Design a protein around this ligand. Structure first.
Ligand code: SRM
Ligand code: SF4
Ligand SMILES: [K+]
Length: 464
């Protein structure tokens, strides 16, 4: 298992050129796969090239997590905040937390984020430990801490469940690392190590109680949490296209379907990104939606960068629906896959695009995700519409998440095929188009209309 460490998804153009060369010359599939934890993966490396890939990463200042004994995963950080001036400091803290957690053997892997409201692009409720940034005058002052998210479930096993993260309270910036260590060590000590399926923090919190865990974290960190400071999310999507950053700098976010970077007929995505890497003056940022930001372009350079991106297929227009859909890797490389996900999504969303046009909502979107098995890597269990692989060509259909990702969708239909999913969504999208209130999301609508019951307390009411 290769898990390249890249806190906050920030990667230099020198680093990009090295991984581009390795992917093209030293792997079966020839691709760079952006992951939804803001890093990248190679597929099909070979025995003769495993030692070369660690040397390659080292040659450009990169390292892979020692997954055999390191239970941490990549630390996420909001990639393209609306208050652009906050990114540098938030990214600095994501790096500090990432380095602080480098090798205490944990009972189960442990996932952390740094979030900048109003964007929940990093999907905080899928993670064990979340630091929600609070700022004054463009300067970070502290974090709200939320603990205990996690999406993995086992089909037919009602002792497993997806869970959102719970608010603990606010901490001043100076206590960040002490709090992070206290959460990790409390989970290390209290987690159910013997039963790996019960070992995640989400289960520990439900076993001992949120207040009990929170009080122990306060004891170990030497602090008392303050009341939560106000925050609200408005969405989870990337900002596709150009946005203005700090100074005279501009950020170009490129939609990349499934994060799969390869040269395709008439769409040389991989060569195009290499060409951009050779001239770009800043860094790249891999997003948690498997897209790529060409970050910090001076205004005078926009035309040159855009020319390469448009000619290479990296700026081919897609619907808002496609921009807000995601799938995991699944087949052909995942050994755990039950149903296709990545290879299913492009034609599935072609069909969804037709339904959206049919019902006159082609400018709208539904956060729609496909995960190839119930491990949940595609984050379908935070979607408005989630598909969870069951068997070849068959999925459980979940409805009733929301746009901002703070609610688990309940299972609506079990073990059905794509034609059955599309027939159901045709009916439901049509109802939503006609009956929605102003600005009302599809997931909120399915709950309000009584199409599906909401999940209010997943440890006790996720399963029917
Ligand atoms: C690449 C990625 C999906 C993607 O399309 O982007 C992915 C791919 C895989 N994940 Fe993951 N997971 C990815 C995000 C996730 C997430 C979502 C997230 O973290 O934001 C989850 C659900 C959140 C959570 O953990 O609760 C996730 C939960 C899992 C699990 C179930 C963990 C559990 O608690 O039970 C496994 C299976 C396991 O660990 O035993 C797993 C295992 C795997 C493996 C390594 C399969 C394996 O064990 O052999 C996958 C390799 C597929 C392949 O061929 O490349 N992956 N995986 C993501 C890589 C992120 C990264 O850079 O580290
Ligand atoms: S969800 Fe299942 S199929 Fe998809 S990548 Fe994760 S483990 Fe593989
Ligand atoms: K994408």
């Amino acid at each position: 298992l290769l898990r390249c460490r890249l806190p906050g998804g920030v990667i230099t153009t020198k680093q990009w050129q090295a991984i581009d060369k390795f992917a093209g010359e030293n792997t079966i599939y020839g691709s760079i796969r952006l992951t939804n934890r803001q890093t990248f993966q190679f597929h099909g490396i070979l025995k003769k090239n495993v030692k070369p890939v660690h040397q390659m990463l080292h040659s450009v200042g990169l390292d892979a997590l020692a997954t055999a004994n390191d239970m941490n995963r990549n630390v996420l950080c909001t990639s393209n905040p609306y208050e652009s001036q906050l990114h540098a400091e938030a990214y600095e803290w994501a790096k500090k937390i990432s380095e602080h957690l480098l090798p205490t053997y944990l009972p189960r892997k442990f996932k952390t984020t740094v979030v900048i409201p109003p964007q929940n692009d990093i999907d905080l409720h899928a993670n064990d430990m979340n630091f929600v940034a609070i700022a004054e005058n463009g300067k970070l002052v502290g974090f709200n801490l939320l603990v205990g998210g996690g999406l993995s479930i086992e089909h037919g096993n009602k002792k497993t469940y997806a869970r959102t993260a719970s608010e603990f309270g606010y901490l001043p910036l100076e206590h960040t690392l002490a709090v992070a260590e206290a959460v990790v060590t409390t989970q290390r000590d209290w987690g159910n190590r013997t039963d790996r399926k019960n070992a995640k923090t989400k289960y520990t919190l439900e076993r001992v109680g949120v207040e009990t865990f929170k009080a122990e974290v306060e004891r170990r960190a030497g602090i008392k949490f303050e009341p939560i400071r106000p925050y609200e999310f408005t969405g989870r999507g990337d900002r596709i296209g150009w946005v203005k950053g700090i100074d005279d700098n501009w950020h170009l976010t490129l939609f990349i379907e499934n994060g799969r970077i390869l040269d395709y007929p008439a769409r040389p995505l991989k060569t195009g990104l290499l060409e951009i890497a050779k001239i770009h003056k800043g860094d790249f940022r891999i997003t948690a939606n498997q897209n790529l930001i060409i970050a910090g372009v001076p205004e005078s350079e926009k035309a040159k960068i855009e020319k390469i991106a448009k000619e290479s297929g990296l700026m081919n227009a897609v619907t808002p629906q496609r921009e807000n859909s995601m799938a995991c890797v699944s087949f052909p490389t995942c050994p755990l896959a039950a149903a296709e996900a990545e290879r299913f999504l492009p034609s599935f969303i072609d069909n969804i695009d037709n339904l959206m046009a049919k019902h006159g909502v082609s400018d709208e979107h539904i956060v729609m995700r496909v995960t190839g098995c119930p491990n949940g890597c595609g984050r379908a269990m935070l979607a408005e519409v989630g598909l969870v692989g069951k068997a070849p060509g068959r999925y459980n259909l979940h409805l009733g998440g929301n746009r901002i990702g703070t609610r688990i969708p309940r299972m609506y239909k079990e073990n059905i095929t794509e034609p059955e999913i599309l027939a159901s969504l045709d009916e439901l999208i049509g109802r939503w188009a006609k009956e929605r209130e102003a600005g009302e999301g599809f997931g909120d609508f399915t709950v309000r209309a009584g199409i599906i019951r909401p999940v209010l307390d997943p440890a006790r009411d996720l399963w029917d």
